Design a protein around this ligand. Structure first.
Ligand SMILES: CCN(C)S(=O)(=O)N1Cc2ccc(Cl)cc2[C@H](C(=O)Nc2cncc3ccccc23)C1
Ligand SMILES: CCN(C)S(=O)(=O)N1Cc2ccc(Cl)cc2[C@H](C(=O)Nc2cncc3ccccc23)C1
Ligand SMILES: [Cl-]
Lengths: 305, 298
């Protein structure tokens, strides 16, 4: 019993964190095999950030301008290349702690663990989600650039995010491990703001099914809804549209609890209308949207209370 | 910017998790040097005469895909210590520490000696933890990291009827009035950790959330009278002293913030949130707030 925001064990990622220095800038890098991956803005000054020509800045650098530190050991850079917004530094030593890994690009609503680092040293681990507006609500200070997001289903680490910047509202923007940004964001200090955010509907539904599995049903009602009528109501509360894919994905939780997806949608419509009235759901007074259907099946028991 | 429930990096603890099987029971063990520590209920009462029947070869210890040979066994309170033939080469610098209610720690939840998740939690004033555990999680451990030294503070033993959890320090002494056996036992009425809510209000101010600040101040005595009525723990002068750094950083005296807490308790939040929460959060200590709003590394 119990339901917590749970992150993956971070050990396989800790053994990959290194410090990357270029002139006055110091940030974090991900050391996998003989390559160190880091944000390309490590080559910029604060002035360069308004309109950086990364290609012009990189061509002026040589291998020995990049200082890479792994623990108390200096690594030797023997090559360098840019791939989108990531810099790939070829080093002379392969990381003996390299785990089994993949680079995966995620979709909004997907969750992942973040290992927040400063000076190539891990300081904390937390769980978060890719928001529908492509930002993440993280906890990052200056020096955290290069910190990574990952999932560890089985013993394979799937790297999905690398931290690049903080937007004016305090939210964060970054790239997949191939250097492609999530969202319309650029690694430029330009006037850019996160779009209006929405609630991840399929995740709130999954979390309501987790509450039913843990023995709570106070929020259920005798009604059902069509998918269209649910979306017409949900859009009015800034909830993401629920698609037929979302309904199919919730199938296993629906069969386990005995409650149809469209009946759970009717409870959601009612919670949005009435609020919680002094009650909580899994120790929360708000509707939680940072647990996917997959996270709920992984964390919760296979036997409903 | 941002404020998350953050756990310590779990790697130094992952390298210590093993699976212990004895009879039909399988649970987790902590392998440090040549000793495996696990809940004594794995032998399952009078544990000493139940233990005397067992031989070293009855305890099956598995570290990854490698079998560890048990060469000795002894009990210390509610923990079983299995002497093994091999010292753990991944043993970190460590201490066994007993924590107080209100203190926080990270839990590495494991099943079959394999870590599956890490989360942050607090020792409740009623000595239970609101964790997330299924059958097979027994032996999972709680810890803090103070530089490069892991301080082990908790070992999971059982789930109570309300879904909350009970366990021991690494010397086998339970937190709370619990016993390791199937009997009628329940968690006492819980209270809110006042010094932790105050720390979290200071974190909200640091992150630019000031709607709850007011011009008023209060006395420690008047605040405690009010707090006792909302099932909040008494605030002591030690708590006030501990909040000193956050008081100087934000410019809000601890009794000035206590008056904000008083108004929140009597009026509610009125449709507003603080750090994305509609409830007053009590699982961040003053040190957690200073650490997360400063970037301390391990
Ligand atoms: C607050 C962000 N700035 C305006 S900044 O510090 O001047 N700035 C501009 C900037 C622009 C583009 C890119 Cl790709 C990176 C950056 C840098 C940046 O975003 N780094 C930070 C990252 N994460 C959390 C951060 C919290 C605090 C400070 C800095 C953080 C550096
Ligand atoms: C619900 C607890 N039971 C009644 S039990 O499963 O029959 N039971 C009895 C019992 C008695 C004493 C002691 Cl020290 C341990 C236990 C066991 C126990 O607490 N294990 C569990 C631990 N954590 C989460 C658990 C979730 C689900 C089940 C079991 C969990 C095992
Ligand atoms: Cl995805």
């Amino acid at each position: 019993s119990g339901f917590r925001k749970m992150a993956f064990p971070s050990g396989k990622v800790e053994g990959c964190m290194v410090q990357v220095t270029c002139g006055t800038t110091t940030l974090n890098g991900l050391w996998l095999d003989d390559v160190v991956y880091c944000p390309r803005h490590v080559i910029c000054t604060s002035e360069d950030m308004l309109n950086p020509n990364y290609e012009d800045l990189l061509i002026r650098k040589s291998n020995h301008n990049f200082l890479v530190q792994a623990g108390n050991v200096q690594l030797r850079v023997i090559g360098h290349s840019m791939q989108n917004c990531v810099l790939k530094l070829k080093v002379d030593t392969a990381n003996p702690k390299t785990p089994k890994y993949k680079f995966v690009r995620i979709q909004p609503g997907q969750t992942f663990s973040v290992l927040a680092c400063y000076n190539g040293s891990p300081s904390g681990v937390y769980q978060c989600a890719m928001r529908p507006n492509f930002t993440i609500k993280g906890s990052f200070l200056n020096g955290s650039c290069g910190s990574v997001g990952f999932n560890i289903d089985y013993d394979c680490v799937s790297f999905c995010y690398m931290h690049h910047m903080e937007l004016p509202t305090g939210v964060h923007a970054g790239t997949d491990l191939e250097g492609n940004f999530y969202g319309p964001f650029v690694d430029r200090q330009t006037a850019q703001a996160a779009g209006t955010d929405t609630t991840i509907t399929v995740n709130v539904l999954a979390w309501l099914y987790a509450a039913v599995i843990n023995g709570d049903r106070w929020f259920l009602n005798r009604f059902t809804t069509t998918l269209n009528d649910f979306n017409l109501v949900a859009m009015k509360y800034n909830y993401e549209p629920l698609t037929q894919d979302h309904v199919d994905i919730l199938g296993p939780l629906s069969a386990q609890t005995g409650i149809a997806v469209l009946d759970m949608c009717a409870s959601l419509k009612e919670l949005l209308q009435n609020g919680m009235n002094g009650r909580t759901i899994l120790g929360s007074a708000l509707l939680e949207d940072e647990f996917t259907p997959f996270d709920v099946v992984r964390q919760c028991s296979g036997v409903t209370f």
